[PDB]
């Protein structure tokens, strides 16, 4: 059982290659997750210069195997059950009245490090809009992440609506559609319907000259 890999603190590496309206960029990240607390801490650097999109729009792309599954729900932690071999995470993210991100990720162990490698593609964004015009506040809210099994794909289907606070007091919704399928052929837990209560907080390293993001996530499963 993959649950075993998560009983202590696990180091994490993150790598993302992106292209939004033709603007290419790369990000690298490191930190650690502790599933016993449901805690994740990560720092990201844009290695190509300036990030062409707002940092909060990439938060959900930048490892739900670090959720805390209460003991009575351990039967439904598909994320852990897929490791070490790992799992594919794909999303399409529809920004209300704007463009969309499509993403492709693999989350897996390489020895003692959990690795999350992402490709991201965004298109049809307005040059005046909240995203390309950098009108999102640098902050994040709480959301519920709804998980249901997908028996035919041997995986899960996931959906939620992220609320991005805009600097003029409006809110920009980002509608997430998500699926996850194992990478190995080992058996995986297909869960009953449930959700992950997700909270996050963004901040900055003042000793960091490069464009960057410090990310903190707290995630606990619920609904059973």
């Amino acid at each position, epitope marked *: 059982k993959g649950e075993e*890999l998560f009983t202590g603190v696990v180091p994490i590496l993150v790598e993302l290659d992106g292209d939004v309206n033709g603007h290419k960029f790369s990000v690298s990240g490191e930190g650690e997750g502790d599933a016993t607390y449901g805690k994740l801490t990560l720092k990201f650097i844009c290695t190509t210069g300036k990030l062409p999109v707002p940092w909060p729009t990439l938060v959900t792309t930048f490892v739900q195997c670090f959720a805390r599954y209460p003991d009575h729900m351990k039967q439904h932690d598909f994320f852990k059950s897929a490791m070490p071999e790992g799992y594919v995470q794909e999303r399409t993210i529809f920004f209300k009245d704007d463009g969309n991100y499509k993403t492709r990720a693999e989350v897996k*162990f*390489e020895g003692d490090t959990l690795v999350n490698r992402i490709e991201l593609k965004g298109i049809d964004f307005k040059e005046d809009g909240n995203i390309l015009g950098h009108k999102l506040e640098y902050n994040y809210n709480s959301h519920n992440v709804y998980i249901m099994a997908d028996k035919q794909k041997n995986g899960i289907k996931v959906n939620f609506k992220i609320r991005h606070n805009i600097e003029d007091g409006s809110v920009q919704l980002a509608d997430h559609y998500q699926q996850n399928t194992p*990478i190995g052929d080992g058996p995986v837990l297909l869960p009953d319907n449930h959700y992950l209560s997700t909270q996050s907080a963004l901040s900055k390293d003042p000793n960091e000259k490069r464009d960057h993001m410090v990310l903190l996530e707290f995630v606990t499963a619920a609904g059973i």
Partner: nanobody
Amino acid sequence: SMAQVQLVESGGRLVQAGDSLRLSCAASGRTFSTSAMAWFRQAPGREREFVAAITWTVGNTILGDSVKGRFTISRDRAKNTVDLQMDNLEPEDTAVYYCSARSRGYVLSVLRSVDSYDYWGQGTQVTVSG
């Protein structure tokens, strides 16, 4: 969207004991998913034997006991190659050298085992004469 990866070894030669040689492997296909690559070697009448492995993201390396301090594995993610630098070659290094790759994630201990890889090249011959 295909998982298939293809591996092409090169560089095997006939060489004198105490010489060095560099082998190279080229991966293509869904290289995005690669998580480890490795070199094994097989001599006639013998089981295939672990030589060296390298984790793909970080570059952590594992060497088989009988090449420790002589062989060096390294990989280049931009070119999707993994090279095996063999110094101080001995007649007993004579074998066909195979390149392999894994895409599933793993704990480190399974990487020495032939059964832990999803893709294999067709080998390149190394002969060491003394």
